[PDB]
């Protein structure tokens, strides 16, 4: 168990960050 930070470029006007948990 645990969590980690994730990020990636999305669309064509900025990026997005997600917090995956596993």
């Amino acid at each position: 168990r645990g969590c980690y930070t994730r990020c990636w470029k999305v669309g064509r006007n900025g990026r997005v960050c997600m917090r995956v948990c596993t």
Side-chain angles (χ1 to χ4, degrees), residues 4-21:
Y4 298 100
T5 298
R6 268 179 78 81
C7 237
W8 77 108
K9 71 194 286 184
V10 197
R12 197 89 173 191
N13 207 251
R15 300 108 157 184
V16 168
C17 237
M18 71 187 242
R19 48 145 158 164
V20 67
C21 233

